[PDB]
Coordinates of C-alpha atoms and ligand atoms in Angstrom, one line a residue:
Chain A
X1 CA -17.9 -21.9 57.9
X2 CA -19.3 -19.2 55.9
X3 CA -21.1 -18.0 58.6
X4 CA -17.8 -16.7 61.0
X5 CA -16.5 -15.2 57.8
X6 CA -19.4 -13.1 57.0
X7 CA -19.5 -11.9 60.4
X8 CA -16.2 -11.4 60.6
X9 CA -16.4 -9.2 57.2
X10 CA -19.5 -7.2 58.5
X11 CA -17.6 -6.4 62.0
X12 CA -14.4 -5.2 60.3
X13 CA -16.4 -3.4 58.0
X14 CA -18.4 -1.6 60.6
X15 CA -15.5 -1.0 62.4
X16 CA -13.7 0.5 59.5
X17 CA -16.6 3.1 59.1
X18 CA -16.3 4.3 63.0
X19 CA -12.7 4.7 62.8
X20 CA -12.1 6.0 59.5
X21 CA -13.6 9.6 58.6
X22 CA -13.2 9.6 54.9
X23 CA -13.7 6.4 53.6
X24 CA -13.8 5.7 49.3
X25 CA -16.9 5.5 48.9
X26 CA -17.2 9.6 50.3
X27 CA -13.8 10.3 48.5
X28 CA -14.9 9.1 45.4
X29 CA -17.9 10.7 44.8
X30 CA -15.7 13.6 45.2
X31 CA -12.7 12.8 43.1
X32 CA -14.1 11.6 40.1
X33 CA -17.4 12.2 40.9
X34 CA -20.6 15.0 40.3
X35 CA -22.4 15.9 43.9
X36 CA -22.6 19.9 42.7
X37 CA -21.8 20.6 45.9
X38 CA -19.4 21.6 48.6
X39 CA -16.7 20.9 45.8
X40 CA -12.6 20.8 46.9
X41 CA -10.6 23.2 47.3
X42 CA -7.7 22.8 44.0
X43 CA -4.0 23.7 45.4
X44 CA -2.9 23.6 41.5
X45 CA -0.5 26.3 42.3
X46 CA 2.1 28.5 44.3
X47 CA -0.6 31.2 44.9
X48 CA -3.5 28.7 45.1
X49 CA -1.8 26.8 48.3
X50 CA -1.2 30.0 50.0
X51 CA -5.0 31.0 49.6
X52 CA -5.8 27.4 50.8
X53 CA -4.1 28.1 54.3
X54 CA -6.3 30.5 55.1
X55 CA -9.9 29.3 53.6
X56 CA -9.3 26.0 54.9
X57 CA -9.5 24.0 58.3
X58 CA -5.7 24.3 59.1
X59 CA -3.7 23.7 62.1
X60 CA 0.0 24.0 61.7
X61 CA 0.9 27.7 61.0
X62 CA 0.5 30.7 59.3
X63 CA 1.0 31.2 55.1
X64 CA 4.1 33.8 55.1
X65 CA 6.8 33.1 52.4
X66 CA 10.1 35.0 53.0
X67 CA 13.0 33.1 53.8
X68 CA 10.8 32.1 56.5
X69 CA 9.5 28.5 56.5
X70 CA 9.4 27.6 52.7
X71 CA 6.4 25.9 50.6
X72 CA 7.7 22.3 50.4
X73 CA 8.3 21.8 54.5
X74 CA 5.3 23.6 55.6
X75 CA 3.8 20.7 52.7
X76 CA 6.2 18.0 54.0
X77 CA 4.9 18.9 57.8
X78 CA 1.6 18.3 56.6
X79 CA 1.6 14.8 55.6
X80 CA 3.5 14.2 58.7
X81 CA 0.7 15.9 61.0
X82 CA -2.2 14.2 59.4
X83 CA 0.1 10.6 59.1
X84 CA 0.4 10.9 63.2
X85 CA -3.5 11.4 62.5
X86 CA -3.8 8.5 60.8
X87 CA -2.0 6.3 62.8
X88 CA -4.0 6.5 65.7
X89 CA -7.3 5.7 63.7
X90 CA -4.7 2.6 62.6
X91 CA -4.5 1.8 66.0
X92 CA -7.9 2.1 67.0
X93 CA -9.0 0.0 64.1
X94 CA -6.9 -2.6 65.0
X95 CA -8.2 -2.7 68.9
X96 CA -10.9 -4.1 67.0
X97 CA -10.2 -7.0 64.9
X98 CA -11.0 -10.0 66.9
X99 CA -7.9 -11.6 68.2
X100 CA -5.8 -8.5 68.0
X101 CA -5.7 -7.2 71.9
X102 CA -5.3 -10.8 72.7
X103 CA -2.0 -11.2 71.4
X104 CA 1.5 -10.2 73.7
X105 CA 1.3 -6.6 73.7
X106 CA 5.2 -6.3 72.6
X107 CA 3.8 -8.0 69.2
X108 CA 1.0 -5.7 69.3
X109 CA 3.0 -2.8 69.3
X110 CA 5.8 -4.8 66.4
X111 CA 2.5 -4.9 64.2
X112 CA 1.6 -1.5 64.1
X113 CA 5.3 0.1 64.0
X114 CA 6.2 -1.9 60.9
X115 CA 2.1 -2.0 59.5
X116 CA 0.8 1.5 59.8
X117 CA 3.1 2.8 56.9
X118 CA 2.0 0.1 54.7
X119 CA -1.7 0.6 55.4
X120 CA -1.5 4.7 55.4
X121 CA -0.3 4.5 51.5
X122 CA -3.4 1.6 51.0
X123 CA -5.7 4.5 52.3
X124 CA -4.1 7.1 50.4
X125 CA -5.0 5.6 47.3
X126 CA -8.7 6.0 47.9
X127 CA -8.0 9.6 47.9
X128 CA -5.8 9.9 44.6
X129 CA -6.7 9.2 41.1
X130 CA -4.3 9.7 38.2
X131 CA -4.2 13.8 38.6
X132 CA -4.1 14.1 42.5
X133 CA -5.1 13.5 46.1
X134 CA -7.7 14.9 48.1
X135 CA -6.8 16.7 51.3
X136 CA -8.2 18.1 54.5
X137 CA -10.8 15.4 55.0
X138 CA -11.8 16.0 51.6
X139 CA -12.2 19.6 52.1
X140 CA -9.0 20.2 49.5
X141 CA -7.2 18.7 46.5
X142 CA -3.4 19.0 45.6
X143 CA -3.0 17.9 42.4
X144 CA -0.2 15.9 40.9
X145 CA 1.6 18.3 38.9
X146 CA 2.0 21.0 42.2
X147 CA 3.3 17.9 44.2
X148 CA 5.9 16.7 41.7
X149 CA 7.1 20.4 40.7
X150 CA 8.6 20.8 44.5
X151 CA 11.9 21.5 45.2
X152 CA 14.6 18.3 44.2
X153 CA 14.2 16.1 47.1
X154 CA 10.3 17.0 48.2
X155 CA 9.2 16.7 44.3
X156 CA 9.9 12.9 44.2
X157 CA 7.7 12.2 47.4
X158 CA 4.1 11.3 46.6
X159 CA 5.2 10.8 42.3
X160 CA 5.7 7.0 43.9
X161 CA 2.7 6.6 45.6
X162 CA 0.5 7.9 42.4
X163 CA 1.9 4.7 40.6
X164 CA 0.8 2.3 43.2
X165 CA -2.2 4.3 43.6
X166 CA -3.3 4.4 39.7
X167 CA -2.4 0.5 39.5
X168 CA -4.5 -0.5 42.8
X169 CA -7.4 1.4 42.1
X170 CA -7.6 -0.5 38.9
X171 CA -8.8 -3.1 41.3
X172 CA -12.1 -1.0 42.1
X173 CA -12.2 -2.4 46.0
X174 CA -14.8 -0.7 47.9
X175 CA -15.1 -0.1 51.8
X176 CA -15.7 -3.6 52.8
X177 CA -13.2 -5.3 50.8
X178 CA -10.9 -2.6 52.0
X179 CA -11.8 -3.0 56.1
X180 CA -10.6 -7.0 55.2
X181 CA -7.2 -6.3 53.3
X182 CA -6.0 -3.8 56.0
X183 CA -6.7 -6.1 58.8
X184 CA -4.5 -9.0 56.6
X185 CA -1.8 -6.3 56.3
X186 CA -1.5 -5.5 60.4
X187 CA -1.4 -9.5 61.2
X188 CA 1.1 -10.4 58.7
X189 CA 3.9 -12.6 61.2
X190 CA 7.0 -12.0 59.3
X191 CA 7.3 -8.4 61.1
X192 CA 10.6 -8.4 62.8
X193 CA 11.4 -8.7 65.9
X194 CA 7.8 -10.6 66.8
X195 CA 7.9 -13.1 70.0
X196 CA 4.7 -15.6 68.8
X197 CA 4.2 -15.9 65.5
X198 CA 1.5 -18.5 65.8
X199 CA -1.3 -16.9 66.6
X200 CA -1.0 -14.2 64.4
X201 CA -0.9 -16.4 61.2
X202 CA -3.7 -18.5 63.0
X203 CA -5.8 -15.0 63.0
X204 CA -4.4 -13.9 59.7
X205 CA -5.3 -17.3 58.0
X206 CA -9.0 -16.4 59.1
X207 CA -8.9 -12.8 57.7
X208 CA -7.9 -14.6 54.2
X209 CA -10.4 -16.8 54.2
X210 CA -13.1 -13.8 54.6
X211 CA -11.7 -11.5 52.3
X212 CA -11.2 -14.3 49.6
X213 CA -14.9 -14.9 50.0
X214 CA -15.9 -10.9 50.3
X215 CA -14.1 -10.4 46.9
X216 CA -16.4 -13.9 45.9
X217 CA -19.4 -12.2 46.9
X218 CA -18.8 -8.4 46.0
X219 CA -17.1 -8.9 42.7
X220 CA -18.5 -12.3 41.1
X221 CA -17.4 -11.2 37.9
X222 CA -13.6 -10.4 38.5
X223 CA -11.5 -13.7 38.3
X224 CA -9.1 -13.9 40.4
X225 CA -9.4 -10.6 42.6
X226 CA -8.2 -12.3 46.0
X227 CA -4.7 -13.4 44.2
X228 CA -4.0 -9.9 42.4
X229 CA -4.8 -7.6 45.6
X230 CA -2.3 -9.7 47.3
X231 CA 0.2 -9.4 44.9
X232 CA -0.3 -5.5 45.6
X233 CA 2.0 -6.2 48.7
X234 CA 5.1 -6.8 46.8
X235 CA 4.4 -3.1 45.6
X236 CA 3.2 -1.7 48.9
X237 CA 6.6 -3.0 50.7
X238 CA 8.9 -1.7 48.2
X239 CA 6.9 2.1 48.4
X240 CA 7.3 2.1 51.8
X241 CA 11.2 1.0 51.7
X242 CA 11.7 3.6 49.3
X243 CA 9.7 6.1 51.0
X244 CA 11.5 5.4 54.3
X245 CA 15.1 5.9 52.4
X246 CA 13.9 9.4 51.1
X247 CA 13.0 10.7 54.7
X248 CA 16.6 10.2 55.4
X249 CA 17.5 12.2 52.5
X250 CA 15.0 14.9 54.4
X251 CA 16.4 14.0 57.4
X252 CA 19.1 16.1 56.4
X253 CA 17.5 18.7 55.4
X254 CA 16.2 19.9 59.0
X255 CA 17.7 19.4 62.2
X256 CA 19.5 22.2 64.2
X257 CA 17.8 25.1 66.2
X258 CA 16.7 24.9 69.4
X259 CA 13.6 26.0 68.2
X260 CA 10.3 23.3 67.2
X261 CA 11.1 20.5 69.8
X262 CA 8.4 18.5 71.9
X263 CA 6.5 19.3 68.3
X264 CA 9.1 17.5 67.1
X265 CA 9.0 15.1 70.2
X266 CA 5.6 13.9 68.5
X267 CA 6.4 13.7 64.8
X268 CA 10.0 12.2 64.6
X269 CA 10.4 9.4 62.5
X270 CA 6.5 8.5 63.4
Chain B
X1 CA -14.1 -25.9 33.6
X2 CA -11.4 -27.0 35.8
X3 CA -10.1 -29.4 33.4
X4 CA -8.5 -27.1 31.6
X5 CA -6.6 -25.9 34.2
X6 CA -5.2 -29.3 35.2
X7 CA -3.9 -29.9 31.9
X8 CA -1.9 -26.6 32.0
X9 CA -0.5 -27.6 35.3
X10 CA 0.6 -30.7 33.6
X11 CA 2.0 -28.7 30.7
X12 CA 3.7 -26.2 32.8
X13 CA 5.0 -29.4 35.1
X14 CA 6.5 -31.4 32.3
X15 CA 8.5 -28.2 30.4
X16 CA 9.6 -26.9 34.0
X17 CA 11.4 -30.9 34.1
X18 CA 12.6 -30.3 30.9
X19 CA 14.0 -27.2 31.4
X20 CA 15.5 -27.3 35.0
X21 CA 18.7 -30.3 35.4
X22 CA 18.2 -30.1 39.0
X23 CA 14.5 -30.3 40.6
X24 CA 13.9 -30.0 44.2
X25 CA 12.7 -33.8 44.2
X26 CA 16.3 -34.2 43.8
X27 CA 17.4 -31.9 45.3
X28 CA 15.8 -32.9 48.9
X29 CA 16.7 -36.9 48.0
X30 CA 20.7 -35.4 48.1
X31 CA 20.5 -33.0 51.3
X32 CA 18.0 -36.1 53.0
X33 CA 20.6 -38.6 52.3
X34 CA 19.1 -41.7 52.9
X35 CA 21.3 -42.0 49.9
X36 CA 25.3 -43.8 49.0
X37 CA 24.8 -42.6 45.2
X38 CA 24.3 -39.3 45.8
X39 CA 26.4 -37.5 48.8
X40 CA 28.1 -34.0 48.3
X41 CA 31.4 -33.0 49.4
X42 CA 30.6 -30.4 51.8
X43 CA 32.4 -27.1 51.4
X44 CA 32.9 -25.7 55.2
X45 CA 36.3 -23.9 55.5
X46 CA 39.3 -22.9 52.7
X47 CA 40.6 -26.5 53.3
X48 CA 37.6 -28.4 51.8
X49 CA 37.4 -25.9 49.5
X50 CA 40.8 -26.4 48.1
X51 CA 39.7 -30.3 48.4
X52 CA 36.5 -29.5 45.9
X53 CA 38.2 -29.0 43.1
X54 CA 39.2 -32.3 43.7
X55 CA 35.7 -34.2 44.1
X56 CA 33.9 -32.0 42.1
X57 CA 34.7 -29.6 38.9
X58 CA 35.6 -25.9 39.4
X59 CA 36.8 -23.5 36.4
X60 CA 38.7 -22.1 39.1
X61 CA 42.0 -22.4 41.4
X62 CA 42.5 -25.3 43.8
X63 CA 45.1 -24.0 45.8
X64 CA 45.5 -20.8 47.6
X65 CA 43.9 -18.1 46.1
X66 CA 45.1 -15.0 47.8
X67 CA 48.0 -13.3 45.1
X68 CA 45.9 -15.5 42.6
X69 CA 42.4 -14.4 42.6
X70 CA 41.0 -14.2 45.6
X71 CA 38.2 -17.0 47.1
X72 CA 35.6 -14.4 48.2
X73 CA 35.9 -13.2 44.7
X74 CA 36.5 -16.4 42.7
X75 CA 33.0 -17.9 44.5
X76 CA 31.2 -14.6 43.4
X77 CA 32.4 -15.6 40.2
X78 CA 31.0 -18.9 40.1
X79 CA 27.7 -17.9 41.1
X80 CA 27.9 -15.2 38.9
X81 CA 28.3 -17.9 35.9
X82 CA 25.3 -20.2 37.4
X83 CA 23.0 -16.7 37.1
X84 CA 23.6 -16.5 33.2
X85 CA 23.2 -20.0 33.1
X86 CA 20.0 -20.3 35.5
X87 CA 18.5 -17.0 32.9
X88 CA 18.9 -19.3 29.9
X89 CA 16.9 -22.2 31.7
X90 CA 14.2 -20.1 32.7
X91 CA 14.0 -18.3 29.3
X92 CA 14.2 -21.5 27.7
X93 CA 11.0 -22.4 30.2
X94 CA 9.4 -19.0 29.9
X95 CA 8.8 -19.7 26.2
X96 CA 6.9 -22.8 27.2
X97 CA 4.1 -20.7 28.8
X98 CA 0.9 -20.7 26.7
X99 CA 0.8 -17.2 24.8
X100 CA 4.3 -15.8 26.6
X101 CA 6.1 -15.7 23.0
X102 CA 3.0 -14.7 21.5
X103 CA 3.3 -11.2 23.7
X104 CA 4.9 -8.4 21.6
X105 CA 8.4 -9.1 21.9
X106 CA 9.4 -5.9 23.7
X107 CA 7.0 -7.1 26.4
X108 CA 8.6 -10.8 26.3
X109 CA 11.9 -8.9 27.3
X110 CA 10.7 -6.9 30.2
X111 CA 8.9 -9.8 31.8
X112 CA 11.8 -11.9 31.4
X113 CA 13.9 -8.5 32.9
X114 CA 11.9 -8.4 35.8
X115 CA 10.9 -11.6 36.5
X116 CA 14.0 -13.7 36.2
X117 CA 15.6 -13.2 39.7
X118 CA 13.1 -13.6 41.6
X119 CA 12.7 -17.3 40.1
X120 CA 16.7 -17.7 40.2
X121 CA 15.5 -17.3 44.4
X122 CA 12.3 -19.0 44.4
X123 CA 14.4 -21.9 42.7
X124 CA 17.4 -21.8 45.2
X125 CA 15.1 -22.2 48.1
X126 CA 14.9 -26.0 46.4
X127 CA 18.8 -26.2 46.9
X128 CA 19.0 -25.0 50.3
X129 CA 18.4 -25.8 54.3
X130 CA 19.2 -24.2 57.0
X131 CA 23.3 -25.1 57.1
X132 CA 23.9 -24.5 53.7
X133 CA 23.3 -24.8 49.8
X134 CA 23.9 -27.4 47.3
X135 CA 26.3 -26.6 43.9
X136 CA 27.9 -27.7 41.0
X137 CA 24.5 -29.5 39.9
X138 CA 24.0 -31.1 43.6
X139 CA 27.9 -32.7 43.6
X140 CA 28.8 -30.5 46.2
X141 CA 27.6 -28.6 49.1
X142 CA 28.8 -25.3 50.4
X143 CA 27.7 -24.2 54.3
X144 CA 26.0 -21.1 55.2
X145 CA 28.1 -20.7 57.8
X146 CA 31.6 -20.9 55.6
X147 CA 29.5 -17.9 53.1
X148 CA 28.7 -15.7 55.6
X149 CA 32.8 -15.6 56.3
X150 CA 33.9 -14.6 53.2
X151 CA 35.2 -11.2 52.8
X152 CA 33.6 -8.1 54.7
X153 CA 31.0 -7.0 51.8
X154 CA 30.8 -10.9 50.1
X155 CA 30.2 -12.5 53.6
X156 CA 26.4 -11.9 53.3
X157 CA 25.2 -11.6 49.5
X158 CA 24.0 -15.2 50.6
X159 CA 22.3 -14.7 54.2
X160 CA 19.3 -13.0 52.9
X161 CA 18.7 -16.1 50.4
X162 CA 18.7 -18.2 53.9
X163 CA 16.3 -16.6 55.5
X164 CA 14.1 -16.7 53.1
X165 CA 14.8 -19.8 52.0
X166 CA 14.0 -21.2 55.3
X167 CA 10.4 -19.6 55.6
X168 CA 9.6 -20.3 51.8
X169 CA 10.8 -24.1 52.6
X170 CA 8.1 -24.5 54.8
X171 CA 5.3 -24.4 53.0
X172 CA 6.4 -27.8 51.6
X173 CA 5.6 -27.0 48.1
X174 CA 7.0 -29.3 45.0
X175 CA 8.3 -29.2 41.7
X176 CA 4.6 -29.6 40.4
X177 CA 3.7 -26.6 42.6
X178 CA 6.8 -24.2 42.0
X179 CA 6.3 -25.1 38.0
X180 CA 2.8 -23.1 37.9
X181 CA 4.3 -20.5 40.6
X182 CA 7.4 -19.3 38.6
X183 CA 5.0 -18.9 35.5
X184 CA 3.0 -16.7 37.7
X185 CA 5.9 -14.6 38.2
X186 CA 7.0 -14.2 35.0
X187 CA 3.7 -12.8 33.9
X188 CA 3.7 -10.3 35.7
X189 CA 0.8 -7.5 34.4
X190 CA 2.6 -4.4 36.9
X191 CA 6.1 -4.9 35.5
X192 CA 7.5 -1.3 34.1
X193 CA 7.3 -0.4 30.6
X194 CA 5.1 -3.2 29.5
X195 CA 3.2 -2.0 26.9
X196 CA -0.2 -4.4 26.3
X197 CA -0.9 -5.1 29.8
X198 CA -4.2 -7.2 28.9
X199 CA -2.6 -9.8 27.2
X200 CA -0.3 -10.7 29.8
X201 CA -2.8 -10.4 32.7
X202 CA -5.8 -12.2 30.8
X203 CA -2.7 -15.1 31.3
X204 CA -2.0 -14.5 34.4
X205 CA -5.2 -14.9 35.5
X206 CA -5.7 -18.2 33.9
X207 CA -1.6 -19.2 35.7
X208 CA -3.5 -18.0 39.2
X209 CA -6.5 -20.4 39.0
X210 CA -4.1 -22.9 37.6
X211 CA -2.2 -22.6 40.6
X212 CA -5.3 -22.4 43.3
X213 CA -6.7 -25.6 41.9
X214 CA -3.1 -27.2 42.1
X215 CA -2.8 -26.4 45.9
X216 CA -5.9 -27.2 46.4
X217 CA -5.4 -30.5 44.7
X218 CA -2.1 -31.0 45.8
X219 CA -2.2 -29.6 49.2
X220 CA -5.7 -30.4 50.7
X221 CA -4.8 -30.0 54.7
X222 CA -3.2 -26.5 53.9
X223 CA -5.2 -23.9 54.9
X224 CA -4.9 -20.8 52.4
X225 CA -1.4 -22.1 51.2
X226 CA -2.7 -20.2 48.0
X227 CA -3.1 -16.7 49.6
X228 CA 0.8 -18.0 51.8
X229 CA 2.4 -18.5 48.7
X230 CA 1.7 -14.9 47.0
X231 CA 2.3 -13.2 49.7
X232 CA 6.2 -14.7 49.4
X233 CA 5.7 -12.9 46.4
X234 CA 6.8 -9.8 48.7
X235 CA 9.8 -11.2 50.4
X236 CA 11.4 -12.3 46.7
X237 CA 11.7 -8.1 45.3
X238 CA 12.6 -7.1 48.5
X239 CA 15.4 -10.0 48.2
X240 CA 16.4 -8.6 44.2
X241 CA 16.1 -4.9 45.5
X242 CA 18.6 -5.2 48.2
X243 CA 20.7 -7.9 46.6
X244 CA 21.1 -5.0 43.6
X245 CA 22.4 -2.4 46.2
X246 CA 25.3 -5.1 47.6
X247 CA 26.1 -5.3 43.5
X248 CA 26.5 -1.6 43.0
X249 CA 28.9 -1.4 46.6
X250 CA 31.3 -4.6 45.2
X251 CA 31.5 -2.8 41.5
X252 CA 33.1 0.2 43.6
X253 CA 35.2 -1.7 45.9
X254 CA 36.2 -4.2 43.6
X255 CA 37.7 -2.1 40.4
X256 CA 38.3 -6.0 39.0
X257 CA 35.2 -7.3 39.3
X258 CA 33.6 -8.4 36.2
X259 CA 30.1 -9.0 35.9
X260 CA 28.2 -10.7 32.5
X261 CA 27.0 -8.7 30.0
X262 CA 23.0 -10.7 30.1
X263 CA 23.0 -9.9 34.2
X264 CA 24.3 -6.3 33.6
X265 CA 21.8 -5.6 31.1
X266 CA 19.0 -7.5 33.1
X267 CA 20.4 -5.3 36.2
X268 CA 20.1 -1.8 33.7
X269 CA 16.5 -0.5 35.2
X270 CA 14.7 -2.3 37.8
Ligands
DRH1 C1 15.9 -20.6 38.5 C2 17.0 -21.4 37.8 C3 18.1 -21.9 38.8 C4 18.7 -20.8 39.6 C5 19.8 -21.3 40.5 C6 20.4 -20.1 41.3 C7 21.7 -20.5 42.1 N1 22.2 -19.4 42.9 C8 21.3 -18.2 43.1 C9 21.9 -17.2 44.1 C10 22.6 -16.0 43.6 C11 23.7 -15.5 44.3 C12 24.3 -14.3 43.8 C13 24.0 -13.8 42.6 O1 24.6 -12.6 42.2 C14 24.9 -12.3 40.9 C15 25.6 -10.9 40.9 C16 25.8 -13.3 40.2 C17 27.1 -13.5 41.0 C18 23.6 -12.1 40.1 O2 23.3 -13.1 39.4 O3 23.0 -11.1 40.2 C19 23.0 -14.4 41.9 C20 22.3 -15.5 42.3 C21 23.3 -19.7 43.6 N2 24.0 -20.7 43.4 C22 25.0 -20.7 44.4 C23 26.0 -21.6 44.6 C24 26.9 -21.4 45.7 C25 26.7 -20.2 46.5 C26 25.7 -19.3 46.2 C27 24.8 -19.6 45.1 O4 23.7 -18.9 44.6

């Protein structure tokens, strides 16, 4: 019935909203958007990201370039500061889709290893548009061109996700579509390694059904939405495989010193 | 009006037998048995190998193969040929697709590029269970177990068909299904370097509600089978991505190994 579906949308919605800080709807009318004021800080540039670390809310270090801590980790530490960030409002959302903390906790815990990463670059997107990505909880924006102009292996990083960004935001999903497809992402049933499968898809099946008939409601005039946004996963999975097989091209690229652990007891391979 | 979309299912349907010598229908009568006129040899060790080319038909060697062309290799051959041959079937459907030849030509190739292997997997789900995979146009049948033996990089080009094979087999679809399926896949609006993206999605679109209204139709007790069968969408690239990395590792190892010049050129990209 209609009626456990539209309930089901407004909950995950709701939920969405408490456990995500910036959603679109805030990052957009930033982006590519007016509201003359509090306007982003634009890391376009060498100069312009060193500035940035010091006229921005930042917790990582200190802007010093001398052979001491280069541009492209101290960017690369970053993303991997604000992913563990991420991950925990992952998490958190989750707790709260009904079914979820009913299932065996090891399959609880398979979910979110394997469905966090998938969901983090789904988010992402709401903060990029074809030129760049919005950082510091919308308090900064790194454009495209900086991003890609980073040394050989860090320049290739986000260029990926832009593509999949550009291409699902051509979708123009909103919040409440959004709080639906991530919640079909984390009970997908094909994750490795799960011990009942069942009730996942059982749960899953009913997160379909509502987001097919959000996307009926919210966008009566695009055929087809439900079967395209799906589709997206084929691209989604093959980011994240791709993205995984860089950071092992990284991996190599920082290791040694006895200095940094315990911090690096909390990042690792996240 | 719906209409419409049931005669394109019955379109789609009747060029897909047209175009394809061996449909799952008979593909499940011969693996079922049930049957005296249509049992395969079954290929399960180097013995009833050497016995095939004695039931069946195999451009190939009967007896040993070690200092004449080796087995591992020789199989990898034969598949090899079906490829080529499976591309021309599917091309030869492909052009059967309301509006696909009307597509600027560039774009026919890149859709055809892309989408091809995935529906050489899709397809091969048809010819397989869990033991094994039917060949030589359903005459014989070779075991899962015998493949994964072969040679220490051949032994498992095949295992990763399996497994998905054996999910994909259970949602129970049918030739009249798969027909409207594989022509979603081939038109394919996110493939790289297409060049008028409208064209092919405005057909896509009307291949997706084709498709819903076929389950639907065809499928009335199965809940979401729509939303199931796009998400196997995901599991097919992730199939052609990693079956293209075991490729580049036998061209190394194997200074002899041949491949055709339509697969190589398919294989330039991706
Ligand atoms: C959609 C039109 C009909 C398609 C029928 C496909 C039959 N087939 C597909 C599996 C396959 C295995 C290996 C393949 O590798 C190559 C390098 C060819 C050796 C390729 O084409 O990329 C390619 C394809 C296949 N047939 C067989 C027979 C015996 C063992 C394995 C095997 O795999």
């Amino acid at each position: 019935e209609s009626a456990d579906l539209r309930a089901l949308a407004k909950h995950l919605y709701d939920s969405y909203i408490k456990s995500f800080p910036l959603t679109k709807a805030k990052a957009r009318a930033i982006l590519t958007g007016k509201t003359t004021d509090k306007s982003p800080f634009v890391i376009y540039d060498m100069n312009s990201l060193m500035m940035g670390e010091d006229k921005i809310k930042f917790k990582h270090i200190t802007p010093l370039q001398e052979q001491s801590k280069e541009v492209a980790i101290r960017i690369f530490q970053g993303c991997q500061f604000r992913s563990v960030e991420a991950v925990q409002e992952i998490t958190e959302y989750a707790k709260s889709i009904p079914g979820f903390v009913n299932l065996d906790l090891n399959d609880q815990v398979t979910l979110l290893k394997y469905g966090v990463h998938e969901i983090i670059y789904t988010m992402l997107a709401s903060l990029m548009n074809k030129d760049g990505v919005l950082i510091s909880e919308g308090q900064g924006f790194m454009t495209r061109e900086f991003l890609k102009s980073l040394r050989k292996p860090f320049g290739d990083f986000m260029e990926p996700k832009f593509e999949f960004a550009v291409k699902f935001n051509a979708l123009e999903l909103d919040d409440s579509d959004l709080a639906i497809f991530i919640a079909v992402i984390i009970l997908s049933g094909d994750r490795p390694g799960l011990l009942n499968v069942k009730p996942i898809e059982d749960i899953q099946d009913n997160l379909l059904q509502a987001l097919e008939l959000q996307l009926k409601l919210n966008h009566p005039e695009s055929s087809q939405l439900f079967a395209k946004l799906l589709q997206k996963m084929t691209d989604l999975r093959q980011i994240v495989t791709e993205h995984v097989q860089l950071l092992q091209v990284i991996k190599k690229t920082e290791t040694d010193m006895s200095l940094h652990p315990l911090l690096q007891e909390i990042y690792k391979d996240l």
